[PDB]
Amino acid sequence: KKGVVHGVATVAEKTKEQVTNVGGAVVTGVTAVAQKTVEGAGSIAAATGFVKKDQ
Amino acid sequence: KKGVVHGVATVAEKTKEQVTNVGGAVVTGVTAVAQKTVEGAGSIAAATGFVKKDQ
Amino acid sequence: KKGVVHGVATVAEKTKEQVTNVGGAVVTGVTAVAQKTVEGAGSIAAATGFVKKDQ
Amino acid sequence: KKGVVHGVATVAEKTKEQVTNVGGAVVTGVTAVAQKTVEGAGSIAAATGFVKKDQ
Amino acid sequence: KKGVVHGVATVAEKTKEQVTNVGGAVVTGVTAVAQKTVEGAGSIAAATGFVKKDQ
Amino acid sequence: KKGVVHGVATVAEKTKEQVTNVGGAVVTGVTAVAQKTVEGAGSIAAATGFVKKDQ
Amino acid sequence: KKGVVHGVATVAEKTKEQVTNVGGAVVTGVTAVAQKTVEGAGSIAAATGFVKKDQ
Amino acid sequence: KKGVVHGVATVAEKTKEQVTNVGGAVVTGVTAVAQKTVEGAGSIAAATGFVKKDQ
Amino acid sequence: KKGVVHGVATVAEKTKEQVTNVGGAVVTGVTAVAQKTVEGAGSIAAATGFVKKDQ
Amino acid sequence: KKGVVHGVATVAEKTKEQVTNVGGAVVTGVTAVAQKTVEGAGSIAAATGFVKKDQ
């Protein structure tokens, strides 16, 4: 076989899960957050996949 | 087989899940948030997939 | 076989999970956060995959 | 076979898990955080994969 | 076979797990944090994979 | 002060929450269930407060 | 002060939370269940407070 | 002071939390369950407070 | 002071938490379960407080 | 002071935590279970407080 990509690719066979991202956010997984009190200014309480590039 | 992509591709066979994103947000997964009190200015309480690029 | 990529690629066969990211955040895994009180200004309480590049 | 990459690639066969990242965050693994009280200003309480490059 | 990379590559066969990172954070492994009280300003309580390059 | 009860009482002062039960069920708390597929005959999928006394 | 109870009592002062139960179930706390597939006959998947006295 | 109980009592002062139970189940605490697949016949997957007295 | 109990009592002053149980189950504490696959017939996967008296 | 109990009592002053149990299960403590695969028939995977008296 032959393949040429510029990116971003994701090429496969017999594949149970696939995610391609440029951005941006993708949530595909099981996630449970239980929480009782959030205070403070300002605290990232429960972050799973996170990116902060403030300018 | 032969394939040429510019991106972003996601090419496969026999594949249970697929996500392609440029952006942007995609939520495809099970997610449960239970929460009782959020305060503060300003706190990211429960973030799963998150991207902040303020300018 | 033959392959030429510019990146970012992810090329495979017989592959159960795949993630390609440029960004950005991708959450595909099982995650449970149980939490009772968050205070302080400002404290990253429970971070799993995290990136902070403030300017 | 033949392959030429610019990076970042991840090329394989018969492969159970794959992650490619430039960024950014990717969470694909099982993670359990149980927590009772977070205080202080500001303390990284429970960080699993973490990167802080404040300028 | 023949291969030329610029990096960062990860090239393999018959491979159970793969991670490629430039960044950034990747969490793919089992992780359990149980915690009862975090105080102090500011103390990295429980860090698994961590990088701090404040300027 | 003086108090005589037969039960079930719940006597207090300055008290944020109170529940008295004989029965029976009382749900006063925050609860989030997210769920994707339930099968089997017959499986208690997600039970929070539960009592089964079949005769 | 003086108090005589038969039970079940719960007597207090300056008290943030109170539960009295004879039964029966009481749910007053924060609870998050995220779930993707339940099978089998019959499996208690996620039980928090649970009592089974089948006869 | 003077007190005579038959049980079950719970007598106090200046008390943040109180639970009295005869039964039965009481859930007052923070709880997060994240789960991806439950199979088998029949397996208690994730039990927190549990009592099984089948006859 | 004077006290006579038959049991089960729990008598106190200046007390942050109290639990009285006859039964039965009481869950008042922070609990996080993250889980990816449960199989087998039948395996107690993750049990925190547990009692099995099958007859 | 004077006290006569039949049991089970728990009598105190200035006391941060209290548990009285006859049964039965009580979970009041911080607990984190992260888990990736459970198999076998039948294996107690992760048990914290456990009692099995099958007849």
Three-state SS string over I20-39 comes to ECCCCEEECCCEEEECCCEC
CA–CA separation, D32 and C30 (whole Å): 8
CA–CA separation, D50 and D46 (whole Å): 10
Chains that touch I (3 or more CB pairs under 8 A): C, D, G, H, J
Q: CA separation (Å) from D51 to A34, A55, C48, C53, J46?
A: 25, 17, 11, 8, 32
Binding residues of B: 6
Q: Residue B25 pairs with which residues in a beta bridge?
A: A25
In three-state secondary structure terms, E20 is: strand
Task: Give the list of residues 6+ apart from residue J28 with CB closer than 8 angstroms, or none.
Answer: H29, I17, I19, I26, I28, I29, J17, J19
Helices in C1-55 by DSSP H: which ranges?
Answer: none
Q: What share of chain G is helix, strand, coil (3-state, %, to 5)?
A: 0, 35, 65
CA–CA separation, J21 and J31 (whole Å): 19
Task: Give the list of residues 6+ apart from residue B47 with CB closer than 8 angstroms, or none.
Answer: A44, A46, A47, A48, A50
- What does the domain layout of chain G look like in residue ranges? 1-55
Chain H contacts in chain J segment 29-48 (CB below 8 A): 31, 33, 38, 41-42
CA–CA separation, E15 and D54 (whole Å): 36
Sign of the CA dihedral with E38 first, then E43, E48, and E54 last: positive
Query: Residue E45: closest CA among chain C residues belongs to which residue?
Result: C45
Task: Give the list of residues 6+ apart from residue C13 with CB closer than 8 angstroms, or none.
Answer: A12, A13, A14, D12, D13, D14, D15
8 A C-beta contact, residue C27 and residue A29: yes
CA–CA separation, J28 and B16 (whole Å): 41
Resolution (A): 2.7
CA–CA separation, B9 and B21 (whole Å): 9
Q: Please tell me the distance in Å from I3's CA to the nearest CA on chain H.
A: 5
Question: Which residues in chain H have Cβ-Cβ distances shorter than 8 Å to G23?
Answer: 23-24
Instruction: For an interface test with C, give the residue of D33, D43, D54 to mutate (most C CBs within 10 A).
Output: D33
CA–CA separation, D7 and E8 (whole Å): 5
A8 cis-preceded (ω within 30 degrees of 0): yes
Fill in the amino acid letter for E53. Answer: K
Phi, psi of H10 (to 5 degrees): -155, 100
Please give the structure tokens belonging to residue C24: 């950005």
Q: Which of I22, G10, G5, G48 is nearest to F18 (CA)?
A: G10
Q: Please, is D50 exposed, middle or buried when counting C-beta atoms within 10 Å of its C-beta (0-12, 13-18, 19+)? A: buried
Q: CA separation (Å) from D16 to G1, H12, H55?
A: 69, 57, 45
**Does the beta-carbon distance from G34 to H35 stay under 8 Å?**
yes
DSSP C14: S
Question: Which residues in chain H have Cβ-Cβ distances shorter than 8 Å to A31?
Answer: 34
Phi, psi of A30 (to 5 degrees): -65, 135
Of all helices (H) and strands (E), which one includes residue I3?
strand I2-4
Chains that touch E (3 or more CB pairs under 8 A): C, D, J
Fill in the amino acid letter for F52. Answer: K
A24 cis-preceded (ω within 30 degrees of 0): yes
Interface B:G, Cβ pairs < 8 A: 14
Task: Give the list of residues 6+ apart from residue E26 with CB closer than 8 angstroms, or none.
Answer: C49, D19, D21, D25, D26, D28, D49, E19
Please give the structure tokens belonging to residue E25: 């954070």
Q: Which of A49, E14, C41, I19 is nearest to H17 (CA)?
A: I19
DSSP structure string for J1-55: -EEE--S---B-SS-S--EE-SSSEEE-S-EEEE-S-B-SSS---EEEE--B---
CA–CA separation, H54 and J39 (whole Å): 25
CA–CA separation, G24 and F10 (whole Å): 17
Q: How was this structure determined?
A: cryo-EM
8 A C-beta contact, residue E35 and residue D46: yes
